């Protein structure tokens, strides 16, 4: 055939892939975390947006730290051979490198490690996207007039 | 030329390659959410994907999201400490190719 | 629609906006340098800029750099601990527009 460049990911597999949305709105009283009013609007918007991009959207609400880890592990263990990519959206409280389960924090690295090129072979060479809506600290940007 | 660290017989890629982290805010910063309309970042991300997913490469879409959040949003708070604040999303790419949602 | 956090009378942008950090390696990882040829990252960055600066948007150039470093390099060390290792650069963008070095 003619010249082939391979500058863009192959996105014409039978399936675009999964879009896992973890929507944590209500937290255990014991954690002292406030309810995240408005996150349902985000979750719904994401489901519709990725639905139109042809992703298999799966939503999960108010997951504990253990449930988040179990979900990620289970998902990473699926056969993604016929999927072009993988998308995970995290909506919750957080700090630098951390996302909160309803009962406590979870290291983002623990979540993403399940999808490492050597641990999820059916996703090796495919784009793995993690969209994170959560704080990364306590600094505030005063901004500047333009 | 020749060296000890290039052109390996068996091709390998980093286990950390092909990941893209679309953070809602810069490292060390709070992230803003409207209790009624949703977070500034997700609101914007969905709006840009809806309008450009069939027209632009992913990094360019995320750049539009950065501009939308940066220019169109500013916090309102009865607490002076949290009032009139801004936010800039943070694109972290370990991708090795361009990404188009269409083909 | 109307809200408390949009369409401000006085336009402002985040003080952290318009920054781009082109890291040679992923967060928490060592970065490799050939004592003779230079670092894998800089070697690659210069090669891609020389070849694509007058043809591609900056993020796309950096993506080619990611691919070059990820695929073409692998460490060689007499110490088993540091032998046969890989590296993936890390693009961190807080930019609000596309960047072309030419016009």
């Amino acid at each position: 055939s003619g010249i082939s460049l391979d500058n863009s990911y192959k996105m014409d597999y039978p399936e675009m892939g999964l879009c896992i949305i973890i929507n944590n709105k209500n937290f255990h009283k014991s954690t002292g975390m406030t309810s995240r009013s408005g996150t349902d609007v985000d979750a719904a918007n994401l489901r519709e947006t990725f639905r139109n991009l042809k992703y298999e959207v799966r939503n999960k609400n108010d997951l504990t730290r253990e449930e988040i880890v179990e979900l990620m592990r289970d998902v990473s263990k699926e056969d993604h051979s016929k999927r072009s990519s993988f998308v995970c959206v995290l909506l919750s409280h957080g700090e630098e490198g951390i996302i909160f389960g309803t009962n406590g924090p979870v290291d983002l690295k623990k979540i993403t490690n399940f999808f490492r090129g050597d641990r999820c072979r059916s996703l090796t060479g495919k784009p793995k996207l993690f969209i994170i809506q959560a704080c990364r600290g306590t600094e505030l940007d005063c901004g500047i007039e333009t | 030329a020749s060296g000890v660290d290039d052109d390996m017989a068996c091709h390998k890629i980093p286990v950390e390659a092909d990941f893209l982290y679309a953070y809602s805010t810069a490292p060390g910063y709070y992230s803003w959410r409207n209790s009624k309309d949703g977070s500034w970042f997700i609101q914007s991300l969905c709006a840009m994907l809806k309008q450009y997913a069939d027209k632009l490469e992913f990094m360019h879409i995320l750049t539009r999201v950065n501009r939308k959040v940066a220019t169109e949003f500013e916090s309102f708070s009865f607490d002076a400490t949290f009032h009139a604040k801004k936010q800039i999303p943070c694109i972290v790419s370990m991708l090795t190719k361009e990404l188009y949602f269409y083909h | 629609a109307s809200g408390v956090d949009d369409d401000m009378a006085c336009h402002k942008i985040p003080v952290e906006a318009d920054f781009l950090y082109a890291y040679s390696t992923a967060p928490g990882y060592y970065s490799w340098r050939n004592s003779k040829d230079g670092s894998w990252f800089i070697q690659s960055l210069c090669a891609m800029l020389k070849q694509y600066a007058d043809k591609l948007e900056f993020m796309h150039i950096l993506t080619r750099v990611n691919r070059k470093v990820a695929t073409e390099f692998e460490s060689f060390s007499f110490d088993a601990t540091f032998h046969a290792k890989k590296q993936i650069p890390c693009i961190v963008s807080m930019l609000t527009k596309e960047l072309y070095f030419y016009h």
């Binding site: - | 959410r33 977070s39 | 408390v4």
Partner: peptide, 4 residues
């Protein structure tokens, strides 16, 4: 507005 609230922070995450």
């Amino acid at each position: 507005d609230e922070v995450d």
